[PDB]
């Protein structure tokens, strides 16, 4: 494993809703929201 999930959407910022499909060791975490910024 070296890849977990993806970030979709436009502006990738807290102005337009985005999508996050991060997967982990147990479940998946698909959600639609307006995440700000991470740099990590």
């Amino acid at each position, epitope marked *: 494993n070296i890849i977990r999930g993806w970030i979709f959407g*436009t*502006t990738l*910022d807290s*102005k337009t809703q985005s999508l996050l499909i991060v997967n982990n060791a147990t479940n998946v975490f698909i959600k639609v929201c307006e995440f700000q910024f991470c740099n990590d």
Partner: antibody
Amino acid sequence: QVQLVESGGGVVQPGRSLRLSCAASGFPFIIYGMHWVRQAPGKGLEWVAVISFDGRNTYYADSVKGRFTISRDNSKNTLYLQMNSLRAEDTAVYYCAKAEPYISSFDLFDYWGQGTLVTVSS
Amino acid sequence: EIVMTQSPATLSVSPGERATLSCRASQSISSNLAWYHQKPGQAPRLLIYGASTRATGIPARFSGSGSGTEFTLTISSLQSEDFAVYYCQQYNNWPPLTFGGGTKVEIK
């Protein structure tokens, strides 16, 4: 590093045709759209045309609609612009600029070439 | 067609202090606008996109604000590479594509 190099400009007579090229390297050229932007001396920037990442979708400015043709060759990482029926006001410097998808399909010109000169006179 | 207008066409200010520029749109364009920096003889460079977000490699002194039809571009401290011409370009109405007349910032 990215590098957009233009060629094909020069001196032309009114009513004639010219072809310009803009070679691209240093980035995945096949997945990005490219534009042509011209700037008349003493004037601001003027949009001209745009071609999508494959070539089915193209748009033109109302001032050069019908006379200008834009095309690309993915197998060579080259961009062309075929100009026909050149008039006096088409004297300017043309720029080829890569497009970076934002909000819409393409709205930001993030990298620009040095530009070439096109002048028409008798 | 939506027409950009730049009120401060002429701007002379000595290095060190702040400079303020404005661009006006005939119709509401939300925050969909970009600023470009162009010295004489060179290709324009991207400075601000989204009317409030700086581009990569842009020093923090460059900033902007405004939404709708009124926008401003603010440079807190001008340096030796900042005296040039700035253009405002809208991209809300995608098909037309329009640019401002541009402002020339020079040394006082």
